């Protein structure tokens, strides 16, 4: 009785997974992210004793 239940109408459920494992390791970002400095100004000035 496979004709009376065509795949077109029989809409099956899903595991609800979205296999989502893309490279997300960001240790360069992971380091020095806990102290990202959010300035109210656009330029970052400091002094460097060079000589």
């Amino acid at each position: 009785l496979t004709n009376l239940t065509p795949t077109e109408l029989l809409a099956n459920k899903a595991v609800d997974y979205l296999a989502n494992s893309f490279l997300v390791e960001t240790p360069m970002l992971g380091l020095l992210a806990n102290r990202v400095i959010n300035q109210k100004q656009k330029a970052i000035e400091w002094g460097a004793k060079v000589a």
Partner: peptide, 12 residues
């Protein structure tokens, strides 16, 4: 790749 995504301070 397993530990928590750990909300940053770099606001997007």
């Amino acid at each position: 790749t397993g530990d928590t995504p750990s909300e940053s301070t770099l606001w997007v």
